[PDB]
Design a protein around this ligand. Structure first.
Ligand SMILES: Nc1ncnc2c1ncn2[C@@H]1O[C@H](COP(=O)(O)OP(=O)(O)OP(=O)(O)O)[C@@H](O)[C@H]1O
Ligand SMILES: Nc1ncnc2c1ncn2[C@@H]1O[C@H](COP(=O)(O)OP(=O)(O)OP(=O)(O)O)[C@@H](O)[C@H]1O
Ligand SMILES: [N-]=[N+]=Nc1cccc(COC(=O)NCCCC[C@H](N)C(=O)O)c1
Ligand SMILES: [N-]=[N+]=Nc1cccc(COC(=O)NCCCC[C@H](N)C(=O)O)c1
Ligand SMILES: [K+]
Ligand SMILES: [K+]
Ligand SMILES: [Mg+2]
Ligand SMILES: [Mg+2]
Ligand SMILES: [Mg+2]
Ligand SMILES: [Mg+2]
Ligand SMILES: [Mg+2]
Ligand SMILES: [Mg+2]
Lengths: 264, 264
């Protein structure tokens, strides 16, 4: 007997990368579902007995330790930001991807503008070079797909002053991804806000866009020194690490816990 | 010569609890400002040289370790939630405090509804009792004041099944606040959503509202067992720990870093 689309979808929710099970072997849906339900209950029970840490939270903590230990200041800045930042970032009326709140605010679609303000302010007090980073939620309206979430988690690290060269940026990216065990290559790309980017690719998956300043946008943000920076999506990092087929397994969700369905 | 309101406000931005300086001693504004600017630059330089951790991030990490080590599962759930959750929580049309996003979403004003969904789902897979917690951003429109932020950080821990008594709830609260070194008392209060609460007070400052279920709301969320839970604001905890006069010193902000003005 054949499986319906609804039945296949249910089994795909319960399947995990480490399994090797044929969904269309001819084994009935009831036995495939029962087997996968038992494997997933066992997996969740083991997490609850022995680890208890959320993958996104744990990865944020691991990344925070890496950057703090390398001299970067840990920032936590507003998620709800002025809508005026959008136009001022050169997102001309991507603009359609912004979640608006009330009439003068929005959910930040990236960390960059708040970090640019911190670089400018901290350069009045701290010695050269200024090194900061932030990890937290960002928001974009997206077409459904395997590598995009509307609510995702960004890391952005950046530096301003001395040492803001392409080679130092590539070296930090290399140390960072070597620390996480993730293979990558760097390919050129370009974007509306920053211009030319160094995109960090794991196969066809974009893990990061990175930028070597200065750029013309700097003047509108009061940035007047060389700078480098890069933005990474944490759920994309987890998708690679855990071989997830869909990024939703990695997301803030009520539907998956550490990639295990919560519909059991 | 006397200080203007603008001058006093500037000195108050630069003043920290550990200082003992008379603003209206007759010393001129220029010398008070220069002295406080030097103290704050020194403070920020010491943070950058020797700690580099953000107070909110560090406190989240400390609280996470406490609860994980006591058997609670770490949750990270959506911040952008369905607007339908508001009515379903008994926030009758507090309702005016909700930030709406688009037409069917809002920013969560509390963690409770997402945690109720997790308790219900996890009770199908995990052994009794179910113990979970979450730390993250919550949002409410507020009248300006010394103890409220529009963007704040909540901890909520909760348990469902056995052990869901007032005495066990009070014992967890006591262990938690003893771990942070914060004195408190418990006073009864009541709220629209949950009914009677045990409010955890540090002087006149409400650190938490806690609840012993069951309550009538349970049926609308599929909760059908005893439960306990409590919600704490992290910025209020930091206000107590650091003796800040205004909670804004503790907030996600571009204006203060670990309670030090970034306008230097
Ligand atoms: N909607 C999203 N969901 C998950 N991660 C995202 C999303 N948008 C961006 N990111 C992550 O943030 C990083 C920095 O953002 P950037 O603006 O460069 O993304 P992007 O170039 O729009 O990505 P893409 O081309 O895949 O849409 C990306 O390299 C990616 O890892
Ligand atoms: N606007 C806010 N800013 C900062 N912390 C808050 C805010 N609202 C609530 N909290 C924190 O979250 C906890 C749980 O939320 P709860 O709904 O009980 O607050 P509340 O009773 O409305 O607080 P209050 O009476 O002070 O407005 C509070 O005890 C407090 O520590
Ligand atoms: N705007 N502006 N001017 C500045 C000036 C100086 C530094 C910063 C710091 O922030 C950054 O690091 N920018 C690089 C981020 C690259 C990732 C990004 N999400 C992207 O959409 O490609 C901003
Ligand atoms: N809704 N509903 N039903 C349930 C049923 C079971 C458990 C939960 C779990 O969530 C909770 O812990 N509730 C207690 C939170 C108290 C703090 C809160 N911010 C307040 O406004 O007073 C919710
Ligand atoms: K598989
Ligand atoms: K003082
Ligand atoms: Mg994109
Ligand atoms: Mg791209
Ligand atoms: Mg990109
Ligand atoms: Mg209130
Ligand atoms: Mg109250
Ligand atoms: Mg309360």
């Amino acid at each position: 007997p054949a499986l319906t689309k609804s039945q296949t979808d249910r089994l795909e929710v319960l399947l995990n990368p480490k399994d090797e099970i044929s969904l269309n072997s001819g084994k009935p849906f009831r036995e495939l579902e029962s087997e996968l339900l038992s494997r997933r209950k066992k997996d969740l029970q083991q997490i609850y007995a022995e680890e208890r840490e959320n993958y996104l939270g744990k990865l944020e903590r691991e990344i925070t330790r890496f950057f703090v230990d390398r001299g970067f200041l840990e920032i936590k800045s507003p998620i709800l930001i002025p809508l005026e930042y959008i136009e001022r970032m050169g997102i001309d009326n991507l603009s359609k991807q912004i979640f608006r709140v009330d009439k003068n605010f929005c959910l930040r679609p990236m960390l960059a503008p708040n970090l640019a303000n911190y670089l400018r302010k901290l350069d009045r007090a701290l010695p050269d070079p200024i090194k900061i980073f932030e990890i937290g939620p960002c928001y974009r309206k997206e077409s459904d797909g395997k590598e995009h979430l509307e609510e995702f988690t960004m890391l952005n690290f950046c530096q301003m002053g001395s040492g803001c060269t392409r080679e130092n940026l590539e070296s930090i990216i290399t140390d960072f991804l070597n620390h996480l065990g993730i293979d990558f290559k760097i390919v050129g790309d370009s974007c509306m806000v920053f211009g030319d980017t160094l995109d960090v690719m794991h196969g066809d998956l974009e893990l990061s866009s990175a930028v070597v300043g200065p750029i013309p946008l700097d003047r509108e943000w009061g940035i007047d020194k060389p700078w480098i920076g890069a933005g990474f999506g944490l759920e994309r990092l987890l998708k690679v690490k855990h071989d997830f087929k869909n990024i939703k397994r990695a997301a803030r969700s009520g539907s998956y816990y550490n990639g295990i369905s919560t519909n059991l």
